[PDB]
Amino acid sequence: MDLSRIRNFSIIAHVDHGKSTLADRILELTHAVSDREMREQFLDSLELERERGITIKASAVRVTYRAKDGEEYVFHLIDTPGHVDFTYEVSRALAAVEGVLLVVDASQGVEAETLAKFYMALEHGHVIIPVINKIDLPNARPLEVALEVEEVLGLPADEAIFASGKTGEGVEEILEAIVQRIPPPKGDPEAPLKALIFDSVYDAYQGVIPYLRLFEGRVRPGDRIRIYSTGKEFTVDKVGVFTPQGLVATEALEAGEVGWLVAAIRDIHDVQVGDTITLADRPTPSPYPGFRPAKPVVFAGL
RNA sequence: GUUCAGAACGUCGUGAGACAGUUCGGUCUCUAUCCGCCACGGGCGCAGGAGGCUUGAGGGGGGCUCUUCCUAGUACGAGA
Numbered sequence A: 001m002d003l004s005r006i007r008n009f010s011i012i013a014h015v016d017h018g019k020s021t022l023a024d025r026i027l028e029l030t031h032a033v034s035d036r037e038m039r040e041q042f043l044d045s046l047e048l049e050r051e052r053g054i055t056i057k058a059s060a061v062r063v064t065y066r067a068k069d070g071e072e073y074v075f076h077l078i079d080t081p082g083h084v085d086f087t088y089e090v091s092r093a094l095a096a097v098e099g100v101l102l103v104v105d106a107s108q109g110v111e112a113e114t115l116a117k118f119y120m121a122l123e124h125g126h127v128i129i130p131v132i133n134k135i136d137l138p139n140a141r142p143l144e145v146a147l148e149v150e151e152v153l154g155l156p157a158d159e160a161i162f163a164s165g166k167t168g169e170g171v172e173e174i175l176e177a178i179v180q181r182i183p184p185p186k187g188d189p190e191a192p193l194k195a196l197i198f199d200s201v202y203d204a205y206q207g208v209i210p211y212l213r214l215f216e217g218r219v220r221p222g223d224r225i226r227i228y229s230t231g232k233e234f235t236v237d238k239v240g241v242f243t244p245q246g247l248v249a250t251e252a253l254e255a256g257e258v259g260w261l262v263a264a265i266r267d268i269h270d271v272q273v274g275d276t277i278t279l280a281d282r283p284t285p286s287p288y289p290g291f292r293p294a295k296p297v298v299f300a301g302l
Numbered sequence B: 001g002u003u004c005a006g007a008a009c010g011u012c013g014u015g016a017g018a019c020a021g022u023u024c025g026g027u028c029u030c031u032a033u034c035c036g037c038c039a040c041g042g043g044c045g046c047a048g049g050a051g052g053c054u055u056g057a058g059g060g061g062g063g064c065u066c067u068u069c070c071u072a073g074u075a076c077g078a079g080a
């Protein structure tokens, strides 16, 4: 809590470049989970992610005092990977994060993927960070590999903290690197609840649960919220305190805090892949400018 | 199965019969002399008599292959 320090970031790298073990390896270095560690790439939910190791959707992210005497628990994880297909999450879903790691491959080098997203994280305005991954193999000289970055990967070689996900220096700089590197995401203390839903899900039991980062206005447990479109999901319930295993208690959230908001009128379609306009009582005076989903070439023949 | 005799259908024939048209029936003799072959011996040679142990010309036998897993889902790949 408190608009002090802390920042959001979404890991972004090429396929296999190390976006599973790295995004987790840095987790089992502070706390969370006793024995049954990450196991095989955290966020491996849906069970389907397990096999094929094809990361699809695994955000959540919930840590704590992981900063060496400073801002403390402040690093909205975003295990959102991609490789030309699910650029959605890393697109709009990630847009909610003001800073995404750049785990560029140090063995295979930089590919189109990195050069692709690099453009979005440019004009979109965000604090990019490069850092070679998997530095336990023969050809992995972060040196030369870096040359491409300082002359092919946007900025130069500001020390991508080449540590690599799988084992290694356990990437301890992130807690002291990305922290002091990235600032805070606004605050909004006296304004109308105007959160911006990220992805979302379904009910099946306790209505739908769409998570997202809010700008201003803490939705306590029982606040007649609204989202432009009709908006009848009032009564509220809870802010939704994400974690590394599953939903938790959580008292109340505020601006910036990447949480969820469910309960009251579940339904299936009424909030869209995300968005939530605002709350009640003269809220935001505009709609959180979002983005499109998908509808290009490459169709199907079911 | 088809090539016998019995029998029937179809058709051909005035008729007995007939048809690479079908249909059911319907005795398979097989003591080996020689070559060949498989094993096993008999005489005898091996230029002193016998008892053991072997090399090997040479010849035969044998030679098949799939599946997961490791280096690694790494090189390749812009992914699968």
Ligand SMILES: Nc1nc2c(ncn2[C@@H]2O[C@H](COP(=O)(O)OP(=O)(O)CP(=O)(O)O)[C@@H](O)[C@H]2O)c(=O)[nH]1
Pocket (backbone or CB within 6 Å): A013, A014, A015, A016, A017, A018, A019, A020, A021, A022, A023, A041, A053, A054, A055, A080, A081, A082, A083, A133, A134, A135, A136, A163, A164, A165, A166, A167, A168
């Ligand atoms: N030893 C070691 N292995 C690594 C390292 N980085 C990646 N790997 C290996 O390569 C594979 C790919 O890494 P991982 O981050 O899990 O893939 P991913 O990027 O999350 C999948 P996607 O690209 O779709 O988001 C992993 O199975 C892991 O074993 C590293 O720094 N050290």
